[PDB]
Each structure stands twice: as C-alpha cells, then as structure tokens.
RNA sequence: GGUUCUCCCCGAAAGCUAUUUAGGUAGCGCCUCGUGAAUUCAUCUCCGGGGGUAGAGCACUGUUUCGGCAAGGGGGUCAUC
C-alpha cells in the first residue's frame, strides 16, 4: 500500500470506443455507421 | 465529400411488409455478444399423409380434320287457287 501500488479491480475499468482512427482499430473511416443514409449524417436520425 | 495507431475471434444484406413512399425510414428476416434450456436441430433409412405440376388423355368446357348416316337448307322444272 503505497500511492503507486494501488490498482483497480479487474474488469472495473473498460476503454471507450474511439471512432475513425485507422484500419486496425476496427472502427476506421465510416466509424460504425455504414454507408450514406440519414443515419450516417451528423445530427442524423428519426424521432421517437 | 472526408473521417488519422495495432493485433485476435465471429460475420451479413441488397428480401418481405408499410410509407406524400420509391437513392430516406420503421417492424420483421439475415450478423454479433451475453444468459437459459429440451436428443432441441441436421443428414440417411423405414413408417404415415395430402396433392393435381411434368407426362398423358379427349368423358367435360373450347378448338380441329376426314368419313359414313343424314335432320334441314338452298338450286332447277311444272304447280302456283
Ligand atoms: Mg473493438
Ligand atoms: Mg470491420
Ligand atoms: Mg463515404
Ligand atoms: Mg445507399
Ligand atoms: Mg444506413
Ligand atoms: Mg449539421
Ligand atoms: Mg469465419
Ligand atoms: Mg421473395
Ligand atoms: Mg396491404
Ligand atoms: Mg395420391
Ligand atoms: Mg395442365
Ligand atoms: Mg403438357
């Protein structure tokens, strides 16, 4: 127990998705939106 | 139109329905991750079923040719009260 030996529970912290950061990321160009509809646009999508 | 580091595992759709809808979107179908559960599911063999397609046929609804039977047509001639 020193200020540089404390570590979080396992599974307690998970990295966020980061869209549009290359091929390898698995989340490049389109960023998980597919091609070219209303739902791909910034602000795009239909009301409830 | 563009969307910037890496590796591992799985892996579609371009259909149906609706839409001032048709290059948009929503539910379902197909993809993924998780949880739960029945020999649940597949192929083969044997058993039980309904069919009206392929082929065929011409009783029926239609169509078609030839021959006998000819109803009855129509043509001559006299009649034509
Ligand atoms: Mg990822
Ligand atoms: Mg990908
Ligand atoms: Mg694009
Ligand atoms: Mg399109
Ligand atoms: Mg789309
Ligand atoms: Mg805008
Ligand atoms: Mg694969
Ligand atoms: Mg179909
Ligand atoms: Mg209808
Ligand atoms: Mg039968
Ligand atoms: Mg038939
Ligand atoms: Mg036939």
- Per-position DSSP letters for A27-43, written without gaps between them: --TT-S--SSSGGGSTT
Nucleotide at minimal C1' distance from the A33 CA: B3
Q: Which nucleotides of B are covered by protein (CB under 7 A)?
A: 1-9, 23-26
A21, A29 contact by CB (below 8 A) = no
Q: What is the resolution of this structure in A?
A: 2.7
Nucleotide at minimal C1' distance from the A27 CA: B3
Residue A11 Cα to ligand 10 middle (Å): 65
Residues near chain B strand, CB within 7 A:
A 18-26, 28-31, 36-40, 45-46
Contact partners, residue A21, CB within 8 Å, separation at least 6:
A27, A28
A40, A34 contact by CB (below 8 A) = yes
Q: Give dist(CA A31, CA A9) in Å, integer.
A: 30
Q: Give dist(CA A29, CA A22) in Å, integer.
A: 7
């Amino acid at each position: 127990m020193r200020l540089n030996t404390l570590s979080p529970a396992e599974g307690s912290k998970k990295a966020g998705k980061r869209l549009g950061r290359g091929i390898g990321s698995g989340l490049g160009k389109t960023g998980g939106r597919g091609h070219k509809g209303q739902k791909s646009r910034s602000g795009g999508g239909v009301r409830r």
